[PDB]
Design a protein around this ligand. Structure first.
Ligand code: CL
Lengths: 72, 124, 72, 124
């Protein structure tokens, strides 16, 4: 769930198998904000939810003109 | 400057057809790639810093880009305003958006005019 | 965007600054399925959108009893 | 076995308030943490493997756990059935669910009786 910079470097191949198994590991760092490792399938599934939501708001905001343009 | 990927432009088109109408399953990736390719190229060549010019480019490029045989004006409009929203500009519906988009698609309204109208509506 | 787990091992500190800048890096392994490193800020936002959609369809499924419980 | 986290439980509660009604901005994360804590603790203590007994626990713990001043019964029912859905069990609305939740809150219906009702409805 949370490992340090160094531990990842040395046990990266293990972090892969955890991630592949279904875990979402955080990578903390002494300097700046941290990062997260996840499997591509889950990441991309979350990215699509976000994009889908983004489109929903855009379409809600522009609902009238969107409806109108269908008939032009 | 945040941009829209080819793969997003397609997702946007399919999402729009589902919600508002049109024939689905017909979006050409090479067309999406060509539309974004043109926007990105114009920006670099002309060294465009103005967010509303870039928006206007997405709008004309997509409107005339023929991603499929349906909903190209809608994708054009939405893509342009998605760009704006993604770069921190607040957007909203306006009575003149429909007319704008149609004249964009038919070549009667050029990129600059579309830029001026977006800059008027959404730029301080 | 796509790198092998060895180039990651040696250049982990580079991957961090890339990730924090705005990049979303894939990590491939030959014979295995890949992972993705991304900023915690963007990952969490994607996860949250996934979750919103998850609640929205449950609420849809149980829309009738939910409305009824408000008045009790 | 997939569970619901304290931060997910609050998010659910907040999301329900927005959609159906109630006073927002009040959700205590300590109550969310305490509610989940009970559910995990009970599972470990009694070594519960039955999804419907666990589901019953989320329902009773939440309905009596006062995350905030309103919407607790909804958050209870919804988290119960979200847990079932998350663990492969197909859920759906039933006229019985309102009384069931009210009974759990009032103390009139025990955790096992809730588990029985949920099993009858969604078991196989
Ligand atoms: Cl309630």
């Amino acid at each position: 769930q949370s490992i340090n910079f160094r531990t990842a470097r040395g046990n990266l191949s293990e972090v892969m198998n955890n991630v592949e198994a279904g875990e979402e590991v955080e990578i903390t760092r002494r300097g700046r904000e941290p990062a997260v490792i996840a499997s591509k399938a889950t990441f991309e599934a979350y990215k699509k939810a976000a994009l889908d939501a983004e489109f929903a708001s855009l379409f809600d905001t522009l609902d009238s003109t969107n409806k109108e343009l269908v008939n032009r | 400057m945040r941009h829209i990927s080819p793969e997003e432009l397609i997702a946007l088109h399919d999402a729009n057809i589902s919600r508002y109408g049109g024939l689905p399953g017909m979006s050409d990736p090479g067309r999406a790639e060509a539309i974004i390719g043109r926007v990105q190229a114009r920006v670099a060549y002309e060294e465009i810093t103005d967010l509303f010019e870039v928006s206007a480019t997405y709008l004309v490029a997509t409107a005339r880009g023929h991603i499929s045989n349906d909903a190209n004006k809608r994708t054009a409009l939405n893509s342009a305003l998605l760009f704006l929203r993604r770069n921190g500009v607040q957007v909203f519906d306006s009575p003149e958006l429909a007319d704008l988009t149609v004249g964009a698609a038919t070549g009667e309204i050029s990129v600059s005019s579309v830029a001026d109208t977006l800059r008027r509506l959404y730029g301080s």
